[PDB]
Amino acid sequence: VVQYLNQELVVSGKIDFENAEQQYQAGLAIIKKQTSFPLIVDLKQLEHGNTLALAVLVQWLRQTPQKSGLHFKNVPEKMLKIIQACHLQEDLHLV
Amino acid sequence: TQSLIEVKNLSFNRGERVIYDNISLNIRRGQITAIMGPSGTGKTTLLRLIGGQLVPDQGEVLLDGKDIAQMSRQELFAARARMGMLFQSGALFTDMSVYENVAFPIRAHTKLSENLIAELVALKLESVGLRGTEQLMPTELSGGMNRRVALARAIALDPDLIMYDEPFAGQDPIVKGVLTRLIRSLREALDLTTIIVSHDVPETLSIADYIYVVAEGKIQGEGTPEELQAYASPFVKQFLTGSAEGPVEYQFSHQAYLDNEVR
Amino acid sequence: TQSLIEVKNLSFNRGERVIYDNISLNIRRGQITAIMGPSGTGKTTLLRLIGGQLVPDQGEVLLDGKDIAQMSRQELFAARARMGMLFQSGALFTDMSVYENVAFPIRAHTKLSENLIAELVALKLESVGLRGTEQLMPTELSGGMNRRVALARAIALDPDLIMYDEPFAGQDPIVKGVLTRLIRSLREALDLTTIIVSHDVPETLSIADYIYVVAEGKIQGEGTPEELQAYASPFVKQFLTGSAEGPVEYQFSHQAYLDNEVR
Amino acid sequence: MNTIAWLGRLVIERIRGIGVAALMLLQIIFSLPSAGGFGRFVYQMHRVGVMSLLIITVSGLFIGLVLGLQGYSILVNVGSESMLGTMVSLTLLRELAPVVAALLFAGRAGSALTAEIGSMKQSEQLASMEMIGVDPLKQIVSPRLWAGIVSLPMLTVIFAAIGIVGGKLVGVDFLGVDEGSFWSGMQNNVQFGHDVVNGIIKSIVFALLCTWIAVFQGYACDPTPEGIATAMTRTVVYSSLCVLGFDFVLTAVMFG
Amino acid sequence: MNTIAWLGRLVIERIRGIGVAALMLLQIIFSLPSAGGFGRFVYQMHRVGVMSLLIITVSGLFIGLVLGLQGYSILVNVGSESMLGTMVSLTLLRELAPVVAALLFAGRAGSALTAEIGSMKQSEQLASMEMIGVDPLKQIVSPRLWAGIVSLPMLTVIFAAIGIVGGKLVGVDFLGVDEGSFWSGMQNNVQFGHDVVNGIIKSIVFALLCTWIAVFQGYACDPTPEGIATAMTRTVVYSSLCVLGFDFVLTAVMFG
Ligand SMILES: CCCCCC/C=C/CCCCCCCCCC(=O)O[C@H](COC(=O)CCCCCCCCCCCCCCC)COP(=O)(O)OC[C@@H](O)CO
Ligand SMILES: CCCCCC/C=C/CCCCCCCCCC(=O)O[C@H](COC(=O)CCCCCCCCCCCCCCC)COP(=O)(O)OC[C@@H](O)CO
Ligand SMILES: CCCCCC/C=C\CCCCCCCCCC(=O)O[C@H](COC(=O)CCCCCCCCCCCCCCC)COP(=O)(O)OC[C@@H](O)CO
Ligand SMILES: CCCCCC/C=C\CCCCCCCCCC(=O)O[C@H](COC(=O)CCCCCCCCCCCCCCC)COP(=O)(O)OC[C@@H](O)CO
Ligand SMILES: CCCCCC/C=C\CCCCCCCCCC(=O)O[C@H](COC(=O)CCCCCCCCCCCCCCC)COP(=O)(O)OC[C@@H](O)CO
Ligand SMILES: CCCCCC/C=C\CCCCCCCCCC(=O)O[C@H](COC(=O)CCCCCCCCCCCCCCC)COP(=O)(O)OC[C@@H](O)CO
């Protein structure tokens, strides 16, 4: 209900600073043991992404090969409104 | 026309001065609602009643059906986590730097780690346009930028209602220009519901969607900025134009000047 | 183009802050001259130099050829009988009442009888529109009417130069409307020469005849309000309109946000 | 009876003002402590206590110089110049060091507390803190109250110590009384529990009154630039009348 | 040496501030009188003098009550309870009535003078009066200076009179000393020229210092709402250090 591994991690559920500490920590444990880092995060099944779902995504980007090493799948149309609102419209990688 | 805040028949008084005699307002969701009026009145006292700092005398203010006056200490603390308010001077806490001003409402409604608080503050400050200014004091901030730090603090918990009182005042057209781009942009990016209490007519009508005009105790006109002027009372005209014809008097009372002995 | 006040190459400083680096201004007679600019600067410090309260550091201000800095105590006292100044708050002497506020500059430059002073005050107060209000204090005067008592005091000696600093600010369009009818009417009735120091662009261009724009130390543009916009620099544009394109920066400095360690 | 009605309306609003300030004090001292509240108290010990250290030190030295100069002129005519250290130390410890150090605390550290809280009310930082969901009585008012109750009894002990050092300097080192008789007459007649501790009990009562008045007048201010300045001269007048009024009551119990 | 440079820059601006206040005083007292200037002085005797009459009267009574209660306990053990009126009147007339009445004048009437002149500077009534052609040093500042030099020596005489009446009330009427020996011992040892006039000469020196500081800090203020409040606590600190500092110098001359 939060995230699995599934050969590239599927962020699911909802991040609203009452559970938003293990969802950063459990997702970080995948980043510890990943090899070569081409993995793409699947922002498929969120529904209330608001500036804190983004706050745990940038925290995963800082602990990665280089300063990037991370891609993203299709965005639920509420979260990439906040990507360009925070001028990160061309700083991450979206396929 | 689903209304978030809905006011019904309230009355306030401040030293036997009538403010809001008998007035009903509907604040619809996802829309800018402006409350214009002449100055010297208590125009900003509605935002003190919505957030809850003063108590009305014969009225009830409904936040999604729940009254704010009849509301305990753990419902009022949870209601205030859905509201932000930017005061006119941008009421920044002096001693606290720009980082712990923005992080003040976060640390009041959270138990968050230090590394995620420093990422929320860096994203709120940069969405306003103030990324590099985090460690310096509120003094020496070039006061048109004090109202931009105070907008990041008023938005940090990602609310659903934000209240501005007089954002358009004696400001530069450059400084007034940055705020009008920020008020429209931040409410599509976050799906907010804004209330603006001002009396800057050429700037408010170009940003609002439903204007109320409150002269002395009641609504003198309401509607879309297209239909407010067309169905205008003979007060809304003078106010929205500044002409000599209307109910307010330019002379003191009435005389002929050759009727009093001077000395 | 006969100039009453004529400024030539002055420089002022206030705590190592540059105000008026090297600037020359011509105040022609019988015409409204506006000095617009961004706020936070020392825009009102020119009117303190014309009337004579501060001293410039490398400059001379010429009142009809005579310099005000090199001027003795009986020429400066006689020069100030030709000038009036309305401050922004309308600096009325508290304990004094509406009658002895207006009669204060009369009793300083006259030896007049009591029955003619009470006729000058009754004609000055009524030419503004305040005939019946003579015996009551400055407190409880409904502060948009404080600036009308202070306009009668600033005009009582019938001067030839009157200086307003920020008459258009956070005011109602009704209160701002009375002043714009009074600024035009009083200078045809008395043949004055006005200087307005403001930053209210839509109101100033409709009342002025020669606008100077002073950004940081010098003129960025001058002329008739028709020709100021047509020959506009890429500062008078942003300023005159409030757009995003120009020399002033909306971002703090320059970064990419993925270049700093946060914490 | 136009001013008689104005006089009666004046003293009713002052009686009602004591009722608001009493309920404000019971809401501060009867509440649970919270997170990060000790560090706010140590910051306000710097603003109230350490900032007042220079007026208190120099004023205590100047008062001890006058006591040793005046007290020598009395005692030398009755053959009791050896009792100079007894009368210098007992005048400070039971009368002058609790009272004069509370009149300089009400002027410097009392009038600066009602200007800091009052300008937070004018610039609407107290209304902005309340609508966030933080009580300003706990965040702002409560560290400032406890820092004044601790700092004034710590400052009358420094007041009395330099007053005795200043009185020894004019008496022994300039007027020429015996040094061994200065300290031995003092160690014989001055008790610790009856003279030193009774001076600390006075300055704790004065520190509660001088700080509760200074904190109330800034909170219940009039947020207007000459409504703040009217409040700052009310904390100097009301604290000085309460210090001199409670001083007669405490000496009639302790030394009567 | 970053704060050492800040400390040296601080005491240079304070030395330069005494130079501006000295030239400001010589411009007031060496000038010709003008028209309507006596009526402005009688109005400021109401604001400075009559407004301070209630704090001075009640504080003088409370201090005389403590002096008659403490002075009875000393004198009764050496068989000299008839010298109670001598020590009560001579403690007030030469020490306490010049000094304590100047510490309450600096707090009430001194800090209210620097708030009234300072809010005229903020609201630009001083700049508007100057551009009309009237010197504000003569119209505004000069009636307020002379009303404080006259009102403080008139208020220490009322302070000393109720202190003796308050000390007679606890000594004679409650502790039971002889009434005829109270006044006869006082009329024998208290002289008019050496004890009463020397207390008035003290309070004229204190009234000049307490009013020149209070008037200067409002004129050379910082017209900003917490630049006025910083100035009001500077007139209470600087006047209290000057009152206690000049008190040692004046007793070493008069009674040394
Ligand atoms: C002949 C006898 C010789 C004396 C023998 C004593 C020997 C010396 C040893 C010890 C000294 C004892 C002297 C009495 C002590 C005075 C006690 C007192 O005066 O009590 C004070 C009351 O003060 C206030 O209300 C102002 C109210 C004052 C009225 C209080 C009435 C006091 C009555 C009870 C005291 C018993 C006195 C015992 C002495 C005989 C309280 O002081 P604090 O603890 O700081 O409380 C802090 C305050 O903020 C309260 O919250
Ligand atoms: C053994 C002798 C016993 C004494 C016998 C005297 C008998 C009693 C009779 C009369 C009392 C005389 C006692 C001395 C009087 C002190 C004079 C004094 O102290 O002079 C004061 C100086 O004060 C200031 O500067 C503060 C500066 C103080 C330093 C001044 C030095 C004074 C030196 C001359 C005084 C001669 C003393 C004569 C006494 C022997 C001036 O006081 P004012 O007139 O109010 O001036 C108003 C001020 O604002 C100045 O503008
Ligand atoms: C006889 C019984 C004891 C005498 C007292 C009698 C008075 C009645 C009882 C008082 C004690 C009751 C306990 C409750 C105290 C309530 C005050 C309080 O609890 O204040 C606290 C401050 O910490 C604080 O104790 C301030 C922190 C400590 C202050 C005191 C420090 C003591 C150190 C000096 C002690 C002297 C001992 C030295 C002896 C030589 C909490 O304030 P905040 O955290 O900022 O709130 C902020 C948030 O809520 C929202 O932002
Ligand atoms: C046995 C007997 C027991 C006795 C025990 C000993 C008694 C105590 C002994 C000594 C106590 C000395 C008092 C020290 C005062 C410390 C004050 C202090 O330390 O305060 C400082 C400022 O003091 C300031 O104004 C600078 C303050 C003014 C500077 C003073 C200038 C006057 C002196 C110069 C003139 C010389 C005197 C003339 C002599 C002929 C702090 O600076 P701020 O910028 O305000 O705050 C900074 C904060 O934000 C963070 O740091
Ligand atoms: C030893 C010599 C004398 C001691 C003094 C020593 C000090 C140095 C000399 C001082 C005297 C010099 C004379 C010049 C005085 C300059 C002050 C002055 O002249 O002030 C005047 C005020 O009147 C005024 O005297 C104020 C009006 C009178 C004030 C005093 C009133 C005296 C009443 C009490 C006297 C006590 C006597 C009682 C004895 C029991 C003029 O002010 P304004 O009219 O408002 O100006 C306004 C216009 O300019 C523009 O608007
Ligand atoms: C031989 C011995 C010699 C001794 C000689 C005698 C000594 C003097 C004796 C008496 C002196 C009494 C003092 C009188 C004080 C007069 C003050 C005054 O008269 O001031 C008035 C206001 O006082 C005000 O605040 C009202 C002030 C507060 C009112 C007081 C309320 C406290 C009292 C009520 C509580 C009772 C006390 C408790 C007892 C158990 C003036 O009013 P304002 O509106 O401000 O100004 C109006 C102006 O614009 C024009 O008029």
Author numbering:
A (entry chain C): 1 to 95
B (entry chain B), C (entry chain E): 10 to 272
D (entry chain A), E (entry chain D): 1 to 256
What do the authors report?
The MlaFEDB complex is an ATP-binding cassette transporter to actively translocate the phospholipids between the inner membrane and the periplasmic protein MlaC4,5. The MlaFEDB-mediated glycerophospholipid (PL) transport was reported to play an important role in maintaining the integrity of the lipid membrane. Consistent with the previous reported low-resolution A. baumannii MlaFEDB map8 and our E. coli MlaFEDB map9 (EMD-30355), the MlaF (cytoplasmic nucleotide-binding domain, NBD), MlaE (transmembrane domain), MlaD (periplasmic phospholipid-binding domain), and MlaB (cytoplasmic auxiliary domain) subunits are assembled in a stoichiometry of 2:2:6:2. In summary, we characterize four structures of the A. baumannii MlaFEDB complex in nucleotide-free and vanadate-trapped conformations using single-particle cryo-EM.
